[PDB]
Tab-separated table of N, CA and C in Angstrom:
chain	number	residue	atom	x	y	z
A	29	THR	N	-27.042	30.105	-19.553
A	29	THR	CA	-26.952	29.396	-18.777
A	29	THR	C	-25.627	28.615	-18.230
A	30	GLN	N	-24.993	28.087	-19.213
A	30	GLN	CA	-23.669	27.489	-19.042
A	30	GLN	C	-22.742	28.824	-19.821
A	31	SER	N	-21.252	28.693	-19.103
A	31	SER	CA	-20.532	29.456	-19.464
A	31	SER	C	-18.967	28.963	-18.864
A	32	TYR	N	-18.241	28.790	-19.476
A	32	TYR	CA	-16.399	27.976	-19.216
A	32	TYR	C	-15.556	29.283	-19.006
A	33	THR	N	-15.040	28.993	-17.708
A	33	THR	CA	-13.870	30.119	-16.861
A	33	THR	C	-12.877	28.967	-16.790
A	34	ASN	N	-11.350	29.409	-15.962
A	34	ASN	CA	-10.776	28.696	-15.689
A	34	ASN	C	-10.408	28.615	-14.521
A	35	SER	N	-9.777	27.704	-13.467
A	35	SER	CA	-9.210	27.739	-11.919
A	35	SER	C	-7.535	28.089	-12.276
A	36	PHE	N	-7.302	29.200	-12.188
A	36	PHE	CA	-5.683	29.186	-12.082
A	36	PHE	C	-5.269	28.047	-11.505
A	37	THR	N	-5.417	28.543	-9.899
A	37	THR	CA	-4.572	27.665	-9.244
A	37	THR	C	-5.491	27.278	-7.783
A	38	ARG	N	-6.724	27.112	-8.291
A	38	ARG	CA	-7.444	26.701	-7.012
A	38	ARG	C	-7.909	25.271	-7.013
A	39	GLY	N	-8.358	24.913	-5.934
A	39	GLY	CA	-8.990	23.402	-5.613
A	39	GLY	C	-7.458	22.520	-4.745
A	40	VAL	N	-7.091	23.122	-3.708
A	40	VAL	CA	-6.180	22.547	-2.717
A	40	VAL	C	-7.115	22.717	-1.239
A	41	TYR	N	-6.831	21.520	-0.863
A	41	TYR	CA	-6.810	21.183	0.454
A	41	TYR	C	-5.924	20.313	1.173
A	42	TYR	N	-5.723	20.539	2.423
A	42	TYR	CA	-4.560	19.664	3.301
A	42	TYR	C	-5.233	18.136	2.977
A	43	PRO	N	-3.978	17.406	2.620
A	43	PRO	CA	-4.690	16.040	2.519
A	43	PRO	C	-5.140	15.319	3.547
A	44	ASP	N	-3.909	15.294	4.743
A	44	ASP	CA	-4.535	14.692	6.113
A	44	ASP	C	-4.606	15.373	7.304
A	45	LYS	N	-4.705	15.356	8.342
A	45	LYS	CA	-4.889	16.036	9.786
A	45	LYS	C	-3.884	15.918	10.479
A	46	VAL	N	-2.850	16.480	9.929
A	46	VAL	CA	-1.159	16.716	10.299
A	46	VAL	C	-0.647	18.090	10.396
B	1	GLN	N	-33.714	-13.725	-2.074
B	1	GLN	CA	-34.711	-14.775	-1.312
B	1	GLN	C	-33.918	-15.410	0.152
B	2	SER	N	-34.500	-15.840	1.048
B	2	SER	CA	-34.287	-15.929	2.218
B	2	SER	C	-33.913	-17.265	2.439
B	3	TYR	N	-32.830	-17.561	4.006
B	3	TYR	CA	-32.991	-18.554	4.216
B	3	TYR	C	-33.646	-19.151	5.246
B	4	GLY	N	-33.397	-19.842	6.404
B	4	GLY	CA	-34.166	-20.722	7.076
B	4	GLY	C	-33.729	-21.649	7.957
B	5	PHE	N	-33.250	-21.245	9.425
B	5	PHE	CA	-32.670	-22.249	10.474
B	5	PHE	C	-33.947	-22.937	11.140
B	6	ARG	N	-33.238	-23.321	11.525
B	6	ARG	CA	-33.993	-24.834	12.415
B	6	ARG	C	-33.199	-25.489	13.669
B	7	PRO	N	-33.991	-25.498	14.789
B	7	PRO	CA	-32.749	-26.228	15.870
B	7	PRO	C	-32.386	-27.663	15.410
B	8	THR	N	-32.881	-28.251	15.075
B	8	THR	CA	-32.583	-29.868	14.715
B	8	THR	C	-31.184	-30.056	14.039
B	9	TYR	N	-31.340	-28.737	13.128
B	9	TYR	CA	-30.124	-28.997	12.050
B	9	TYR	C	-28.842	-29.058	12.981
B	10	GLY	N	-27.938	-29.635	11.948
B	10	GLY	CA	-26.533	-30.141	12.896
B	10	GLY	C	-25.431	-29.063	13.122
B	11	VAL	N	-24.310	-29.589	12.757
B	11	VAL	CA	-22.821	-28.766	12.937
B	11	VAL	C	-22.902	-28.025	11.478
B	12	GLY	N	-22.739	-26.537	11.637
B	12	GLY	CA	-22.629	-25.681	10.378
B	12	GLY	C	-23.804	-25.733	9.894
B	13	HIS	N	-24.714	-25.875	9.428
B	13	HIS	CA	-26.057	-25.491	9.576
B	13	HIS	C	-26.537	-24.362	10.515
B	14	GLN	N	-26.035	-24.566	11.475
B	14	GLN	CA	-26.439	-23.586	12.790
B	14	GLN	C	-26.181	-22.531	12.154
B	15	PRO	N	-26.830	-21.322	12.693
B	15	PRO	CA	-26.811	-19.986	12.232
B	15	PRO	C	-25.374	-19.340	12.966
B	16	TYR	N	-24.427	-18.372	12.134
B	16	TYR	CA	-23.638	-17.493	12.753
B	16	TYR	C	-23.383	-16.346	12.230
B	17	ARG	N	-22.634	-15.364	12.612
B	17	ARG	CA	-22.821	-13.695	12.388
B	17	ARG	C	-21.185	-13.689	12.297
B	18	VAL	N	-21.055	-12.232	12.142
B	18	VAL	CA	-20.098	-11.522	11.638
B	18	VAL	C	-19.658	-10.254	11.860
B	19	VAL	N	-18.743	-9.923	12.553
B	19	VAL	CA	-18.535	-8.564	12.559
B	19	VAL	C	-17.367	-7.695	12.508
B	20	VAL	N	-17.145	-6.652	11.956
B	20	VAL	CA	-15.864	-6.159	11.261
B	20	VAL	C	-15.852	-5.142	12.083
B	21	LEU	N	-14.689	-4.842	13.011
B	21	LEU	CA	-14.525	-3.518	13.649
B	21	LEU	C	-13.650	-2.743	13.043
B	22	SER	N	-13.643	-1.584	11.881
B	22	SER	CA	-13.052	-0.612	11.305
B	22	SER	C	-12.439	0.373	12.032
B	23	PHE	N	-10.977	0.333	12.444
B	23	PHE	CA	-10.380	1.142	12.782
B	23	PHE	C	-9.782	2.395	12.257
B	24	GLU	N	-9.033	3.162	12.767
B	24	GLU	CA	-8.161	4.102	12.153
B	24	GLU	C	-7.275	4.772	12.882
B	25	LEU	N	-5.911	4.409	13.314
B	25	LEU	CA	-4.601	4.553	14.435
B	25	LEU	C	-4.011	5.614	13.596
B	26	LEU	N	-4.036	6.241	12.705
B	26	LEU	CA	-2.985	7.605	12.283
B	26	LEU	C	-3.510	9.001	13.248
B	27	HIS	N	-2.276	9.573	12.795
B	27	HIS	CA	-2.434	10.614	13.387
B	27	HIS	C	-3.479	11.631	13.372
B	28	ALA	N	-4.311	11.570	13.943
B	28	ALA	CA	-5.411	12.437	13.848
B	28	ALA	C	-6.050	12.535	15.604
B	29	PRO	N	-7.073	13.846	15.550
B	29	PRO	CA	-7.983	13.794	16.813
B	29	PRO	C	-8.939	12.373	17.205
B	30	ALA	N	-8.609	12.122	18.567
B	30	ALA	CA	-8.924	10.987	18.628
B	30	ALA	C	-10.574	11.229	19.407
B	31	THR	N	-11.409	10.294	18.981
B	31	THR	CA	-12.651	10.163	19.819
B	31	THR	C	-13.043	9.039	20.525
B	32	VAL	N	-12.507	8.303	20.257
B	32	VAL	CA	-12.816	6.926	21.321
B	32	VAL	C	-11.346	6.355	21.735
B	33	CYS	N	-11.063	5.961	22.989
B	33	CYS	CA	-9.924	5.570	23.754
B	33	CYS	C	-10.098	4.150	24.540
B	34	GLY	N	-8.904	3.696	25.307
B	34	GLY	CA	-9.433	2.696	25.802
B	34	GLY	C	-9.585	3.085	27.674
B	35	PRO	N	-9.620	2.170	28.573
B	35	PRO	CA	-9.772	2.299	30.056
B	35	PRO	C	-8.633	3.301	30.577
B	36	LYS	N	-7.319	3.630	30.006
B	36	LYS	CA	-6.110	4.263	30.759
B	36	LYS	C	-6.752	5.240	31.010
B	37	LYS	N	-6.471	5.410	32.757
B	37	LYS	CA	-6.619	6.354	33.703
B	37	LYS	C	-5.828	7.408	33.436
B	38	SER	N	-6.337	8.968	33.483
B	38	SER	CA	-5.442	9.819	32.823
B	38	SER	C	-4.644	10.716	34.100
B	39	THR	N	-3.431	10.708	34.033
B	39	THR	CA	-2.409	10.945	35.176
B	39	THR	C	-2.247	12.339	34.584
B	40	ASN	N	-1.154	13.056	35.434
B	40	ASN	CA	-0.883	14.323	35.770
B	40	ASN	C	-0.023	15.085	34.310
B	41	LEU	N	-0.079	16.037	33.754
B	41	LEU	CA	0.645	16.412	32.856
B	41	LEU	C	1.890	17.288	33.333
B	42	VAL	N	2.930	16.316	33.845
B	42	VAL	CA	4.304	16.950	34.486
B	42	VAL	C	4.944	17.157	33.259
B	43	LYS	N	5.313	18.565	33.038
B	43	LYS	CA	6.161	19.753	32.118
B	43	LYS	C	7.565	19.836	32.349
B	44	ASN	N	8.283	20.161	31.781
B	44	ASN	CA	9.794	20.802	31.987
B	44	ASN	C	10.534	19.649	32.632
B	45	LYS	N	10.356	18.239	31.829
B	45	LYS	CA	11.142	17.276	32.932
B	45	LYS	C	11.208	16.098	31.895
B	46	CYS	N	12.292	15.196	31.720
B	46	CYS	CA	12.522	14.294	30.844
B	46	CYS	C	11.466	13.056	31.591
B	47	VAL	N	10.624	12.555	30.945
B	47	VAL	CA	9.608	11.537	30.877
B	47	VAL	C	9.287	10.984	29.848
B	48	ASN	N	8.790	9.749	30.272
B	48	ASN	CA	7.810	9.095	29.033
B	48	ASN	C	6.096	9.399	29.378
B	49	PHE	N	6.038	9.416	28.113
B	49	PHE	CA	4.410	9.948	27.606
B	49	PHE	C	3.785	9.432	27.136
């Protein structure tokens, strides 16, 4: 059911509405 | 537990309220503005905006 993987360069979002 | 007010009470013991108008004035899309009427969008000229 569980497993482990790596997020190389993921998880990026614009800080502010600019 | 609950409080209780009564008209005969003196100053201070009377009931009061509070309101906190949180704002956000950074550069972001506006949802609320004042009553300032909108003028015409004059373009291609040195003007104040």
